[PDB]
Amino acid sequence: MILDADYITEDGKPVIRVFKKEKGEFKIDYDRDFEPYIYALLKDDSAIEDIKKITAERHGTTVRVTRAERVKKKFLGRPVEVWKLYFTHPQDVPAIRDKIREHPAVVDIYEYDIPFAKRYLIDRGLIPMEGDEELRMLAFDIETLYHEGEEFGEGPILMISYADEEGARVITWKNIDLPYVESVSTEKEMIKRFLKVIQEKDPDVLITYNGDNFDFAYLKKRSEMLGVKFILGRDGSEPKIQRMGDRFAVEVKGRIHFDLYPVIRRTINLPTYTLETVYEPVFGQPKEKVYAEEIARAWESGEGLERVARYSMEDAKATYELGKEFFPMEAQLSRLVGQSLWDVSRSSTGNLVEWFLLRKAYERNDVAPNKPDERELARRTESYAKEPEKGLWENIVYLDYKSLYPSIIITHNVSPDTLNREGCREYDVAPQVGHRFCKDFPGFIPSLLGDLLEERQKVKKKMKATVDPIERKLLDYRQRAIKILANSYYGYYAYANARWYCRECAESVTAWGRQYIETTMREIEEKFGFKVLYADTDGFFATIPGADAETVKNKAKEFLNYINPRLPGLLELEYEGFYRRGFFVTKKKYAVIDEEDKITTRGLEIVRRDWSEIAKETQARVLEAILKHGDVEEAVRIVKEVTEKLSRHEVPPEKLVIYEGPHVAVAKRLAARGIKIRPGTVISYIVLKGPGRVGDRAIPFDEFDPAKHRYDAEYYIENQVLPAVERILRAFGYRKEDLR
Ligand SMILES: [Mg+2]
Ligand SMILES: [Mg+2]
């Protein structure tokens, strides 16, 4: 199994290194014979003898064109000739290319910014992560003493923990009694201990959380002074700290540094992500955080410390198992796309599509377009972008659309190379946007999308016919990845930095989308007696007013296999679900309840950061009276009861606690217990009645006596409780005033 590729240089020449892991042992294939190159379109062949003499310099030495050969290719569905120019070292390219294209006989130059090792993987047709191999993985984390007045680097490494299928321990230079900790002389001897560990297990994959921006940039700095050589690469080098966007990323030769942060900030959507945050949504339960306890352990020798140890092995374990959760999808994405997991786990879907197109382009001898320069990219930033029935309804079906966009792309053959072509004998016309797409031949993108979809279907048959749990799981992920990629083409067409950019294609796919949803919703109403209540870009909610639940489910099935044989191409409507009751507020706000009594809402619940218990309980009760019981007036009543108790200081002070000027206040009775507070802390308080603004006197929930402190009743009624139900009831005709 190919893990990755890079290159080094001897006496001015590149040498490719492919890191493999096959049948138990690590291997390194070297290749001294690959050559860098680019392309050029010349106004007349006679100019090459001029171009072969252009020159530049690097490291004080002269750089030239090695060889030049005339070649036949395809550019946007039009045959054409170009010259392939070779060189000696890949870095020669960045230093001589500009000159070559500012020559008069040059229309343009192509494929001059494809990194050498990826160029190699694509041209030699090698595909990383392809086998059936078992890779040893292992995570690790460090803990450093907070030195208030920072100077990033200053302050030893208190702890460092790792995690493997074989347990999970912690190593330290202090004394601590626990069946899983380790104590040694100094931090230096700690760091040497750490290195000796990895050297022993020799992991193929190292897992971390934000390891690209903290953990490696620390173990390093505080090692240049402890006088130790932080060696981890199977080649004996130190981790290579590179630069991606405006932040950084770290690489470890021979291995694979998997940083969860990027993936998670893309696979799971949350308001504020955090190791303990993201750990709960993945599979069940909590962990603990926000310490200033490091300060306590620093001042006392005894303990507090023995608790902080737990924190560590926990970061370490919570890390090893989340990584074990997102590795499969990222590995299949790598195999599907043709690039390493290091790069794939750190890129956007837009880039995944690009890397996929460049490979196919080479495969089919299609020359690639260039990325946008400052101005082109400047233009490409001018963006592109009915009402729901009102009231309470019942016996509702939701009809889903299967692959809407990629479906339209294939059916109408929408591609940059088929756009408004001259002399086209057969073509389709884009709805309101009159663009003509030629059908005299298959379009570049369309063909590839078509091949992808039927591929997914062959994997599904295989997944439904295999009986082994391990193969079934593998085929399942491979199957989902084709889906993620396929549903990314539409967005790609409108991606400013995209090589195969096409605004006429995007607007068109969007226009056809509305025509199809329009005609489908018209059929079901005029020929089957339904009434559409809400519509999305894809599916829609509908029902037959005053009919039995089974009468609606069955009538909807009759509709499906009546409209599909009538729909062109691969598009289909698919039964999705049934709901007993629901109401739709605006273009993206609604609430529904399934038969099992489960309630779902979109854009209605608390998006706050300062929510409280009593505010969350009341909104839930309002939604239950309406959806589970179909009683609007009962909801309205429930909201008055609550504001009444809360106005008569009767509400149990427990449900009033909140997490994260009022803050400036909490920082006082806290800075009293000698507890300092900076940006990453725990702020749990309760609002009280005070001599100033209605929401500025609060104190830690600790300091609370049912006879020394009362609670600011109006803060809860106005800032919190009402704005948690106002929008829902505003849809049934009520206002703020009918709630107090
Ligand atoms: Mg950490
Ligand atoms: Mg830790």
Coordinates of C-alpha atoms and ligand atoms in Angstrom, one line a residue, residues 141-143 159-161 215 287 308 311-316, ligand 2:
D141 CA -0.8 15.0 23.4
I142 CA 1.2 17.3 25.5
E143 CA 0.4 19.5 28.5
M159 CA 3.0 15.9 30.6
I160 CA 2.7 13.9 27.4
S161 CA 0.3 11.0 26.8
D215 CA 1.9 20.1 19.7
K287 CA -15.2 14.4 29.2
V308 CA -4.9 16.6 36.0
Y311 CA -7.3 14.8 32.0
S312 CA -4.3 13.7 29.9
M313 CA -4.9 10.0 29.3
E314 CA -8.4 11.1 28.5
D315 CA -7.3 13.6 25.8
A316 CA -5.1 10.7 24.6
Ligands
MG2 MG -3.8 16.7 27.4

